[PDB]
Design a protein around this ligand. Structure first.
Ligand SMILES: [Zn+2]
Length: 184
């Protein structure tokens, strides 16, 4: 992922101004049946698929595309895995139920979703996040740590260390208060 795209998409300044896409970075770690440790399996990122006459007519949300790539495009099936997602926006109502379905029917997948901004259409989105948590997914807001991790792991930084934008911590704190209230 190029630096301008990351910084533009994962900036946590409340404004819904220009950010019409949803980027999603994922990491997969095998549980390991004996010890306490996790094993690196794979990683990657993706974004939504805008409506297109030569593709998905009704559009393809990043969350749906993510679930599309999991299907045995990875491996195993009888092992426990940790799946972590860093998304620029939290899932819509429809994608939340879809992800909640996945983790409910699988059991061998621990899903942790870290989001930069909280979609919240003020309608059913809030309910969707409660459904995902009910399903056992960890839903949390990205802080300095998650932003830096993604920068170091998913960005072509060309050696440049991560440089936090002003207010990152502030917006991160506020969003955390809103999410905690949404859930409970
Ligand atoms: Zn969606």
């Amino acid at each position: 992922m190029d630096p301008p795209t990351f910084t533009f998409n994962f900036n946590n300044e409340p404004w819904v101004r220009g950010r019409h896409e949803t980027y999603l970075c994922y990491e997969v770690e095998r549980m390991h049946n004996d010890t306490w440790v996790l094993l690196n399996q794979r990683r990657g990122f993706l974004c939504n698929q805008a409506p297109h006459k030569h593709g998905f007519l009704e559009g393809r949300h990043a969350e749906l595309c993510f679930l599309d790539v999991i299907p045995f495009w990875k491996l195993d099936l009888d092992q426990d895995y940790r799946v972590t997602c860093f998304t620029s926006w939290s899932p819509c109502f429809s994608c939340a139920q879809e992800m909640a379905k996945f983790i409910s029917k699988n059991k061998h997948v621990s899903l942790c979703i870290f989001t930069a901004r909280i979609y919240d259409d003020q309608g059913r989105c809030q309910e969707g996040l409660r459904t995902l948590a009910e399903a056992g997914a960890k839903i949390s807001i990205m802080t300095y740590s998650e932003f830096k991790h993604c920068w170091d792991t998913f960005v072509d930084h060309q050696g440049c260390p991560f440089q936090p934008w002003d207010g990152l911590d502030e917006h991160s704190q506020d969003l955390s208060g809103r999410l905690r209230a949404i859930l409970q």
